[PDB]
Amino acid sequence: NQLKEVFSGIKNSNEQTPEEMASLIADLEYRYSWDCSPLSMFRRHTVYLDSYAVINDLSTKNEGTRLAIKALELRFHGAKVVSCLAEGVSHVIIGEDHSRVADFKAFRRTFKRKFKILKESWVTDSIDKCELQEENQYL
Amino acid sequence: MERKISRIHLVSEPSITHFLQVSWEKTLESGFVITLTDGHSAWTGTVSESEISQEADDMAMEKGKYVGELRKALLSGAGPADVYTFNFSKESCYFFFEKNLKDVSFRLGSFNLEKVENPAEVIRELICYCLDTIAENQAKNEHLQKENERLLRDWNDVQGRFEKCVSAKEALETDLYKRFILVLNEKKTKIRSLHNKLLNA
Amino acid sequence: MERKISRIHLVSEPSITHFLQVSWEKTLESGFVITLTDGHSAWTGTVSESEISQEADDMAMEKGKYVGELRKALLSGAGPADVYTFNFSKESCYFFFEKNLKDVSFRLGSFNLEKVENPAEVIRELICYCLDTIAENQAKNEHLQKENERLLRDWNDVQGRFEKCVSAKEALETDLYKRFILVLNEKKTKIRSLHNKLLNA
């Protein structure tokens, strides 16, 4: 009750940016080893989705499939969903369509940092366990 | 290119049904071709823009209203309360339809059809068209049912995930508050220890 | 009662196509009734359980395979690699069908049919059944389309609800964390000041 009353005292705080909030959250989790929580483990990992017919295009959305709901659930669980294929991406989810696996592999090879190829079933299995399942069986 | 097949009861022999097929390109206004059959012999005729326009002018009726009435009568567009009576004099090869209106009958259309020498060809063509359309309808129904089943499964999955998320929201909130109070109590202990050490010093 | 119509092109008359309707109550194992026509004449026959059993005994082959082959051929179930050839002789009133494979044809079955008194009734019932089935298919398609529209609306509503829920969760989490880190920063400033003033005393 005292904590709630104290929090009600503060009016608002919008002096920062989402990237700053993500960095601060990661810093606190690392400092206090709070990675055991039922959510927020995916915060440390950026997630990209193959929801575009043409990679790196914002005018060819494929909304209306399981991919959108999967991305929304990943964001809810704490995953940082990224709409741009930057070199900092660490996780990529590919649905039943494996036509562009070669393109993703080529991009991973070109980038200095390699992001493991993952499937949509991996997150579905992991959510029930609430833990980061090994990517070797879902590569 | 569209065509409609309808059933009719000729007043001359109101015991055996007949089938009339009317086909048009875009609308009945420009014209159409009609074919009457009974399973043994068939007759065919055509109506052009000039003929329909002349008939409408003789009727002193608006072209749109006449076209709508013709569509209702010929394309089996029966309304809530309206009866149309057709009859085809075979001897004179004259087929005409009227709008029976409770003891006052208003003749609607009339044409002269020519007895086609070959009825087998037209009957076979009608059967082929019927089979093609039924096959297309069956395929469309199957595809639509499959899509509906898939969408229902997806909706069920999404609803379950939404229930799980809303259930876990409160758990996340309470866990966050508990962790907050834990670390705050740790900081209170730290400040208390520092104050005690300063007092001792 | 289930009846199915199909088209067969006799080798004798490839140009002309014949329409055959097979009607069975529950299964073909108990026989059925087959009526063939070409638009100008018709023939009818029965393969009642006794006839099919006798034919199977004559061929000395498993009943299941025979019923499967009948389903493939008569009901237009022939696969892309499977070809069935039918031949009907009106003079002998016979009709025999076989399967052609590897350039050799193996006899599948043969029946005897009796010409009907008049084909007009057969054609009329065929057309009436086709029209009724077309109307039923149209109604089913309309109902399925309405249900699909309802499914789309429900899916859109659920997606909007999920988006709202995730947005609310993110907003609550970020606000709580911002407030908490502000409090932690203030407490850390206070403890730093306490430590700084501890040294002098």
Side-chain angles (χ1 to χ4, degrees):
Chain A
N1 313 352
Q2 311 190 23
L3 183 60
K4 185 76 75 164
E5 293 265 26
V6 166
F7 269 40
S8 36
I10 291 92
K11 308 320 298 164
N12 193 30
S13 176
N14 199 341
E15 303 81 21
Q16 297 199 25
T17 66
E19 61 94 352
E20 288 169 7
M21 311 335 297
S23 77
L24 286 162
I25 296 271
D27 194 308
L28 295 174
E29 307 336 306
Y30 163 74
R31 192 78 200 76
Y32 288 77
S33 170
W34 282 324
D35 49 5
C36 314
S37 47
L39 311 162
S40 202
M41 61 305 297
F42 309 102
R43 207 70 50 73
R44 282 263 163 154
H45 328 109
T46 310
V47 298
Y48 196 94
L49 163 64
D50 185 33
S51 43
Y52 283 125
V54 196
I55 293 163
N56 299 3
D57 288 80
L58 305 174
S59 292
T60 177
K61 64 179 180 180
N62 303 332
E63 183 178 2
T65 172
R66 177 170 69 268
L67 307 176
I69 56 174
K70 288 285 134 290
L72 259 66
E73 166 270 310
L74 259 289
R75 193 248 296 284
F76 148 67
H77 265 69
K80 197 250 283 179
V81 178
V82 71
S83 46
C84 183
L85 215 65
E87 289 184 351
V89 179
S90 183
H91 290 44
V92 291
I93 312 303
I94 306 172
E96 56 260 41
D97 186 6
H98 295 65
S99 302
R100 294 169 179 71
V101 297
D103 306 346
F104 285 114
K105 288 175 180 182
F107 304 153
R108 176 186 58 72
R109 297 241 194 178
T110 311
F111 304 156
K112 185 179 178 181
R113 292 184 179 175
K114 297 125 172 54
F115 50 88
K116 56 178 157 159
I117 294 156
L118 295 148
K119 43 176 61 45
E120 73 94 50
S121 71
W122 165 63
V123 299
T124 69
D125 309 317
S126 87
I127 295 144
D128 295 348
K129 244 162 65 171
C130 322
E131 75 93 23
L132 201 78
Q133 308 189 337
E134 291 174 357
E135 63 99 43
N136 305 326
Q137 49 260 55
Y138 299 101
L139 188 74
Chain B
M1 213 30 48
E2 306 87 339
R3 165 166 36 191
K4 176 53 147 149
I5 294 169
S6 170
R7 56 175 75 245
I8 53 170
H9 285 245
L10 271 59
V11 311
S12 85
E13 37 178 347
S15 100
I16 55 177
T17 75
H18 298 45
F19 310 107
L20 87 168
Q21 100 185 334
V22 59
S23 81
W24 66 93
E25 330 196 356
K26 160 56 50 171
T27 322
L28 315 183
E29 321 210 345
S30 155
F32 50 74
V33 53
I34 168 161
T35 323
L36 216 169
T37 170
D38 58 1
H40 178 26
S41 186
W43 301 259
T44 167
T46 169
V47 188
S48 94
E49 172 56 68
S50 84
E51 311 210 56
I52 185 169
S53 82
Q54 183 265 11
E55 215 156 22
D57 153 27
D58 179 285
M59 281 295 117
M61 286 195 74
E62 201 253 317
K63 198 69 155 266
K65 278 206 206 70
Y66 190 90
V67 165
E69 200 67 11
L70 255 292
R71 166 169 306 99
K72 267 178 195 214
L74 273 290
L75 309 201
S76 188
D82 61 356
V83 57
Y84 301 84
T85 287
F86 318 152
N87 42 7
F88 171 41
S89 91
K90 308 161 59 46
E91 311 99 296
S92 147
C93 328
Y94 198 54
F95 148 80
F96 79 89
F97 51 99
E98 36 182 47
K99 179 164 200 197
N100 255 36
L101 212 161
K102 296 160 287 309
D103 320 61
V104 49
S105 44
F106 166 93
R107 218 143 47 75
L108 250 193
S110 80
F111 320 110
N112 49 283
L113 319 182
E114 43 166 330
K115 164 159 178 132
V116 67
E117 79 299 323
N118 202 356
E121 173 56 21
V122 65
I123 297 168
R124 280 146 59 179
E125 200 267 13
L126 204 142
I127 295 289
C128 183
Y129 174 38
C130 289
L131 294 180
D132 289 339
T133 178
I134 185 137
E136 194 220 285
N137 277 12
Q138 198 68 278
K140 227 188 293 196
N141 279 3
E142 183 178 2
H143 178 289
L144 186 43
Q145 199 69 277
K146 183 178 179 180
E147 156 164 6
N148 299 334
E149 183 178 2
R150 191 206 50 67
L151 185 40
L152 178 48
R153 291 187 323 95
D154 257 35
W155 170 80
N156 285 327
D157 163 38
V158 176
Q159 222 62 8
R161 303 335 304 287
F162 168 73
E163 304 337 310
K164 177 57 171 173
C165 156
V166 298
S167 177
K169 137 176 107 171
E170 298 86 6
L172 160 61
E173 181 180 38
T174 182
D175 289 345
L176 186 71
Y177 254 104
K178 174 150 47 163
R179 171 204 288 199
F180 283 173
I181 176 54
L182 177 63
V183 61
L184 262 279
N185 234 36
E186 183 178 2
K187 281 289 182 216
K188 299 332 185 64
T189 36
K190 171 60 69 166
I191 200 69
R192 287 174 69 187
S193 295
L194 257 291
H195 185 79
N196 192 31
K197 171 154 186 171
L198 199 41
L199 273 164
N200 289 337
Chain C
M1 168 24 56
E2 298 291 355
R3 60 136 67 87
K4 182 60 150 41
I5 301 141
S6 270
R7 320 188 227 164
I8 62 104
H9 299 239
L10 299 180
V11 177
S12 160
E13 308 111 282
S15 69
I16 286 163
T17 175
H18 291 355
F19 311 116
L20 74 98
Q21 68 193 23
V22 171
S23 300
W24 67 104
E25 187 64 14
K26 304 304 305 313
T27 77
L28 312 186
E29 174 51 42
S30 61
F32 43 91
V33 60
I34 72 196
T35 291
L36 284 71
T37 170
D38 62 345
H40 198 39
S41 324
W43 301 267
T44 300
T46 61
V47 298
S48 85
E49 199 151 30
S50 40
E51 304 187 40
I52 177 162
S53 40
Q54 198 276 328
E55 159 58 3
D57 304 320
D58 166 293
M59 273 276 266
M61 61 66 58
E62 160 62 351
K63 209 76 155 263
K65 202 219 184 164
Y66 213 79
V67 59
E69 168 266 302
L70 290 173
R71 291 287 220 295
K72 284 196 276 166
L74 289 312
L75 285 293
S76 91
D82 196 336
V83 51
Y84 304 125
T85 41
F86 321 79
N87 255 25
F88 157 78
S89 83
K90 55 213 161 292
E91 282 71 52
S92 148
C93 87
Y94 262 37
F95 158 82
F96 63 94
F97 61 94
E98 328 189 35
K99 174 233 292 185
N100 316 70
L101 184 127
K102 290 177 177 188
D103 321 295
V104 58
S105 95
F106 313 135
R107 167 59 66 84
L108 289 182
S110 56
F111 303 123
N112 64 87
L113 327 171
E114 69 95 6
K115 179 169 288 203
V116 76
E117 49 263 42
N118 53 351
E121 64 194 1
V122 183
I123 298 294
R124 279 193 297 277
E125 61 171 313
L126 196 67
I127 297 302
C128 187
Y129 175 75
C130 277
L131 267 287
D132 285 348
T133 324
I134 287 288
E136 183 178 2
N137 259 319
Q138 186 173 355
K140 262 187 73 53
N141 167 282
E142 183 178 2
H143 206 339
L144 293 155
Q145 269 293 96
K146 183 177 178 180
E147 175 265 15
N148 192 5
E149 188 185 8
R150 190 211 58 70
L151 272 165
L152 265 298
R153 189 181 11 266
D154 191 1
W155 169 271
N156 306 353
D157 172 32
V158 168
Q159 196 67 13
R161 264 175 289 165
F162 208 72
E163 227 295 337
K164 182 216 72 50
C165 207
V166 73
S167 273
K169 174 280 182 163
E170 181 59 22
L172 171 139
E173 174 268 321
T174 185
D175 175 24
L176 268 286
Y177 261 110
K178 280 185 176 178
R179 204 151 296 130
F180 200 69
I181 59 198
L182 192 157
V183 170
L184 292 166
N185 295 132
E186 175 155 359
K187 298 298 300 314
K188 282 221 159 262
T189 300
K190 183 49 163 164
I191 193 75
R192 182 157 52 262
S193 85
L194 263 297
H195 184 65
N196 196 338
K197 64 173 74 92
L198 154 65
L199 267 289
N200 62 29

